[PDB]
């Protein structure tokens, strides 16, 4: 997909506000490459895993999947969504009555 930058230069488009025009085709090509690369990784890894799994893999499969989901939740707190959605004044409004109170405001 080395030609994406060229066609971006040849197309007449207005970039998104306050976003670099140079990196936009880079972003889109990175997304396309990521999608194709992750699909290929999934296909190849599962093709190799079908043949690599055995009775000696009994110690690996459950625990490895556990590790995957463990770091998945850890990422859910680490990089993806951090916090309890604290209110800017500082709160964790859990009671719906407070939600009506701030719908009044």
């Amino acid at each position: 997909g080395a030609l994406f930058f060229s066609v971006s230069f040849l197309t007449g488009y207005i970039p998104a506000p306050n976003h670099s025009a140079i990196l936009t085709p880079l972003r889109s090509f990175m997304g396309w490459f990521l999608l194709i690369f992750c699909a290929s990784i999934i296909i190849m890894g599962l093709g190799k895993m079908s043949s690599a799994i055995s009775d000696k893999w009994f110690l690996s499969f459950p625990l490895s999947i556990f590790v995957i989901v463990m770091v998945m939740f850890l990422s859910l707190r680490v990089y993806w969504e951090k916090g309890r959605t604290t209110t800017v004044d500082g709160k964790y409004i859990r009671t719906t009555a407070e939600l009506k109170e701030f719908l009044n405001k």
């Binding site: 066609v7 971006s8 889109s28 194709i36």
Partner: protein, 630 residues
Amino acid sequence: YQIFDTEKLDDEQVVGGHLALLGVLGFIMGIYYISGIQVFPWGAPGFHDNWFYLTIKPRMVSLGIDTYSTKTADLEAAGARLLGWAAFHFLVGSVLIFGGWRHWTHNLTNFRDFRFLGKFGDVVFNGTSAKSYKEALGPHAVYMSLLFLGWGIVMWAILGFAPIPDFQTINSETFMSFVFAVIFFALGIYWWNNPPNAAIHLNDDMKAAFSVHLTAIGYINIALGCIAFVAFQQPSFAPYYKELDKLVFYLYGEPFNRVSFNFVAKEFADFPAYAILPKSGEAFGMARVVTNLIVFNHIICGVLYVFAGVYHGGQYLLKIQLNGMYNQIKSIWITKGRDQEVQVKILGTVMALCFATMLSVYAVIVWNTICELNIFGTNITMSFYWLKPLPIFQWMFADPSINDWVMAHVITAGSLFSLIALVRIAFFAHTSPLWDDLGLKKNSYSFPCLGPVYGGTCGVSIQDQLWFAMLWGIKGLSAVCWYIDGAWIASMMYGVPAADAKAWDSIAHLHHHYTSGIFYYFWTETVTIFSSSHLSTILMIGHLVWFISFAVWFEDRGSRLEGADIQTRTIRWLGKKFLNRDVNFRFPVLTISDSKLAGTFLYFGGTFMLVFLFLANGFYQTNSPLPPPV
């Protein structure tokens, strides 16, 4: 389903069938014409409106048979003209059916050598007939010249239109009909002085000629659909179409004037009980609706005709491969696939190019979706919004955007995807490289299984490949429908309530607000469908047909066979219990080839039964773009 096989019919049988069918077409044309007369000359209320007649109506407006005028007397005069023309169609169709029966049944008087309009039939064609098809191309062209000349003289004499050659009026149709009569006459006289040379359709040729002509007609129908979509959008055709937006239409199955339960109350005043409620044409965009119906009908009919032409050509190819005629065809249309190495090259190239472009466009679509829903923290600035048709290609599209790019790439990918199966039909009809490697050849146009071997061998036959071609072209036809109904095919959820879903209009600065993304289009069309009971019934019936197709689609016929044996035993036992020795009613389970036939029939039938609802709910595309979400 093979009762009208070409090998069973002679040429005169084909002539008779075609004549009977043209007569019945005239009869149903009269049926539609009398089904569209808004107010009778009697003065009584007439037929409300039909999608048949709403499709036909712009043509009658162009021809002056029917008018869009707002005067009751004008509509009565239009109905009188409609009834007169319907009676003419009825009578001429009756005559055509009479000829069809006199030709299907060989009772006349010389079909091998005859005279056609002998007074000048000795001037043209030397007072003799067209012995063979190559000699028949000439007289066929001259007959079409006579048809064009007849249209011209009828338009001038009965419809009273001028021969003015300016291409912004029906007088253009008159002038060009005369010009086409002249051109067809020239082509026919040349062909009579020199018959063509494509010998493959001059031997036993019914299936071969039928296949090639059906493919040509299918491509002609696709071209006609594109041409009609462009022209019906042109301002010159606007007087005959855009007035559909300016008129109201009362269609069957619309929400009736809702009655009460203690009624001798009604919803709307002065409109009687159970009365079809009025609809404004501006809300439906009835001009776009009608052109969508016509164009998509032509497009799907062309696609199906191409697929069936390829299938019948594959049938003929298998026939000439079985009796050894394949290896002695001097026509280039066989020499380019006889080597069986160019076949592999062609199919592999088509598969690879289809794979590349389809993977590219699918990746673009899913990335647009991901940037839409902010999955994995992707903003809308990460999408393919820079990606547009080039200015060189921009003249093809109005309001150029990623939508048009994805539409073009998707339709090309779908064409190539169906072409994969079409080429498989075209080349591997008797010999396939795998089946040459396996040592097993094929001998029937419908051999479904050939047993579970090398993992299984389902669906190798020509007929099964036709079914697969139709299945894969369903996606291309859906793309066509969704583009002509205004759906945003570039992404999956556009205009949906979510983050950065409206933002497209603020990002691409579009002058046309498209309806919805792929998955939000169903919702935004069913919001209008569910009002109509008729469209709802079509919706449910289409889904019913679709899922009943799966009982014969899946690899389950044997399970159905043993279950039918069990059902037969149960029925026999019970009918012998409560009734005396009644033994009958074996449960019939369709064979696997017939199972695929029925499955494709139901699948296509339902799917496009529902696509009709997509194309008939309304356009519902606004010119005002969505605001930024900010």
